[PDB]
Amino acid sequence: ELRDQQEQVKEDMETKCFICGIGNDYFDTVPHGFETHTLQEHNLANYLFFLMYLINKDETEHTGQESYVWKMYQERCWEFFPAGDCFRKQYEDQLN
């Protein structure tokens, strides 16, 4: 059971994206879709670097999105994270 839990932990990364949770097949409809979504669109390292950038940047120079994320991070409200949505998912209607 411990072995199968480790195997499921490994597999679940390829099945769904960590940040959004959308299944990998929707991305894979476009070739290399998962390899682009996990590395560029929704990347854990990218989110952590964004948080560090917000901390290092002065509050006066914060942009609109930066200030929004700063407020909700200080308030511990994690609604800014895309829950079940992505850029292409949201723009399938108009862009696509």
Binding site: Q5, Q6, Q8, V9, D12, M13, F18, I19, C20, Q40, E41, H42, N43, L44, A45, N46, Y47, L48, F49, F50, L51, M52, Y53, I55, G64, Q65, Y68, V69, Y73, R76, W78, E79, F80, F81, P82, A83, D85, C86, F87, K89, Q90, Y91, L95
Partner: protein
């Protein structure tokens, strides 16, 4: 950042495509430093966010201790991650890793022999193979292909492949001998 934002927000524009083509080197250089994410914007829409990622941050993220912490974090959240607790755990890990990177920056300041043996063994084996494919003996063996029949050629073909098999068995065996000698 401006060019990337424009390209990703208006994909269907050849006028912008020309600018991207002429700026391909700028974007290629900035790719390691450009960080792109998606957030739930205040306008009830998903919005792209572009920012700067420092080389020091990249190096301290690639540092091994941060990697092990990331592995433990990922294993734990996939096992016992909560319904809403998932991203709270994610941001707690992000804060811990930011402190870890700060500490790592503070702390940090400022086989093939067998392959070559096989190469040489094959080299001299093939040298021998061509040397008796080209010897004066085989250059003179053309009288038998005059008194040629079928038995002479059967013998010649069997002898040739038999010598090829001899060269093969000299090889592999020589590799094993050299490997044993070098390891002990």
């Amino acid at each position: 950042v401006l060019l990337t934002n424009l390209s990703e927000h208006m994909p269907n524009d050849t006028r912008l495509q020309t600018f991207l083509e002429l700026a391909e080197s700028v974007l290629n250089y900035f790719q390691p430093f450009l960080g792109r994410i998606e957030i739930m914007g205040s306008a009830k829409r998903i919005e792209r966010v572009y920012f700067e990622i420092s080389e020091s941050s990249r190096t301290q993220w690639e540092k091994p201790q941060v990697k092990e912490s990331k592995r433990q974090f990922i294993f734990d959240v996939v096992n016992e991650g909560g319904e809403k607790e998932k991203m709270e755990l994610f941001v707690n890990f992000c804060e811990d890793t930011i402190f870890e990177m700060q500490l790592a920056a503070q702390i940090s300041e400022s086989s093939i022999l067998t392959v070559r043996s096989a190469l040489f063994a094959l080299r001299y084996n093939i040298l021998t193979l061509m040397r008796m494919l080209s010897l004066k003996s085989l250059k003179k063996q053309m009288k038998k292909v005059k008194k040629m029949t079928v038995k002479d050629m059967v013998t010649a073909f069997f002898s040739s492949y038999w010598s090829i098999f001899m060269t093969l068995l000299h090889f592999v065996a020589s590799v094993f001998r050299g490997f044993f000698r070098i390891i002990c």
